[PDB]
């Protein structure tokens, strides 16, 4: 349990040391143990090495892409169902319901479509969960009910770069730079770290005999 402080200080360091732009300026050193991307970051006079998990970082990107763009498939209801709220202005302002497979007809709410999957059941408790999830929220357009969120987390995990997969500079570069598009992408959807600071390259007086007279 007490070992988790070393994990916390790593994510704490990242929030301060790494900005959205910092990722766009990172350079790929190479692949380490077929599972990590070693990167350099020199800005401004500061120079650091970071270690990136090829799977978790690729996954955090694919996941956040699914969360923002995907329109979930719905079941067109045979007889529409009404609902009472108060909270009524949250539904009558957001097309986050349409993205989550909730097609509506605008106190007086009308449910036209409910989301559907061949591996799970959807109900009104999921519609109300999404109604309360907006209350928490920050950007609200990428908000998803836990059932959908979990399915996207699996889609991302299955489609993302596997650990043990040899990668070329081009792919590794895209994986790291893609992180500049996300907000504080320190963890994958399952809570695993995407990256960590390795070391600062401050004072290394390397061999120079060849330029000395």
């Amino acid at each position: 349990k007490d070992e988790l402080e070393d994990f916390e200080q790593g994510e704490k360091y990242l929030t301060l040391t790494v900005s959205k732009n910092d990722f766009k300026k990172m350079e790929v050193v190479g692949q380490f143990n077929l599972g990590f991307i070693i990167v350099t970051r020199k800005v401004d006079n500061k120079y650091d090495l970071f270690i990136v998990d090829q799977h978790a970082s690729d996954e955090k990107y694919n996941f956040e892409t699914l969360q923002a763009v995907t329109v979930f498939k719905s079941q067109k209801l045979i007889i529409p169902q009404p609902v009472e709220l108060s909270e009524l202005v949250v539904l009558d302002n957001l097309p986050v319901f349409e993205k989550n497979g909730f097609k509506l007809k605008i106190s007086r709410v009308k449910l036209l479509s409910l989301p559907t999957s061949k591996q799970t059941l959807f109900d009104l408790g999921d519609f109300n969960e999404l109604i309360h999830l907006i209350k928490e929220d920050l950007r609200r357009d990428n908000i998803r009910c836990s059932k959908i969120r979990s399915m996207f987390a699996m889609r991302a995990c299955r489609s993302s770069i596997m650990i043990g997969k040899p990668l070329n500079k081009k792919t590794m570069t895209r994986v790291v730079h893609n992180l500049s598009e996300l907000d504080k992408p320190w963890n994958c959807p399952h809570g695993r770290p995407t990256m960590r600071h390795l070391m600062e390259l401050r004072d290394w007086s390397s061999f120079s005999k060849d330029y000395e007279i």
Binding site: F7, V29, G30, R192, R196, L198, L201, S206, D210, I213
Partner: protein, 261 residues
């Protein structure tokens, strides 16, 4: 080689060999270049990630190759049909403002030139004279030793090579002279220091960018395809190099933070 001197230098290398550090290079798994300026490369050995100073390693590597192939080197023929591309020693020494007189540059070229028969025979460092024999200002470098197949060293450090051959080599002592030349060849052979250039700076020219990118690529390719495979196959690590190899990460520690989904 018939020489008593080369054997003393080979024994001196044998006495400095670090068994454990040699095993690290023998089984290296090349990761990549970290700094082209400071010349840091990253390698994996078993469960560890190391930061290596390849300036220091290539120095000992080329020194060791020089020691092994002494008097039996192939040649890098430096001359083309373009006479204007010739390497004039006087022209190289002109990079040194402290050699403020023709005579001081001529002093260095004179020693080098009188020793041209052995520089050619033993080292494959061939010097020619285009005009009259006594014209030091027309002394030219026609060939250099070919230490590694697939490798042609950068000639940016040629001024230093000539200046140090003319001023640092102790021509008077057979052993010190021989060691000194092999050291100069090894120093010239180390891949260049490539200073960092800011690709985000709109203030810097378009032509200076793709040129840094080309130098950055040329070294990454050189280290990966020519140098590290040679290092991995024959490098004997002297103990004075332990300061140049540094452990930066270990898989057991990394696998306590980075975990499966």
């Amino acid at each position: 080689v018939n020489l008593t001197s080369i054997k003393k230098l080979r024994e001196k290398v044998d006495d400095s060999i670090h068994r454990e550090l040699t095993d690290i290079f023998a089984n290296l798994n090349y990761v990549g270049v970290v700094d082209e300026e400071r010349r840091l490369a990253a390698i994996q050995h078993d469960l560890k990630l190391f930061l290596i100073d390849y300036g220091s390693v290539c120095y000992e590597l080329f020194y060791q190759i020089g020691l092994t192939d002494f008097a039996n080197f192939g040649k890098i023929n430096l001359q083309s049909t373009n006479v204007s591309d010739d390497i004039v020693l006087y022209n190289l020494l002109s990079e040194f403002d402290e050699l403020n007189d023709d005579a001081s540059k001529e002093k260095i070229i004179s020693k080098i030139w009188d020793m041209s028969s052995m520089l050619n025979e033993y080292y494959s460092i061939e010097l020619v004279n285009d005009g009259l024999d006594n014209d030091l200002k027309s002394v030219k470098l026609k060939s250099l030793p070919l230490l590694l197949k697939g490798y042609i060293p950068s000639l940016v450090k040629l001024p230093f090579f000539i200046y140090r051959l003319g001023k640092e080599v102790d021509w008077e002592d057979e052993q010190e002279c021989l060691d000194g030349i092999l050291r100069e060849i090894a120093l010239l052979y180390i891949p260049d220091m490539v200073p960092k250039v800011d690709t985000s700076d709109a203030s810097l020219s378009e032509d200076e960018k793709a040129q840094f990118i080309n130098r950055k690529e040329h070294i990454s390719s050189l280290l990966e395809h020519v140098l590290f495979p040679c290092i991995k196959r024959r490098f004997l690590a002297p103990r004075h190099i332990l300061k140049d190899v540094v452990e930066i990460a270990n898989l057991p520690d990394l696998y306590k933070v980075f975990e499966r989904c």
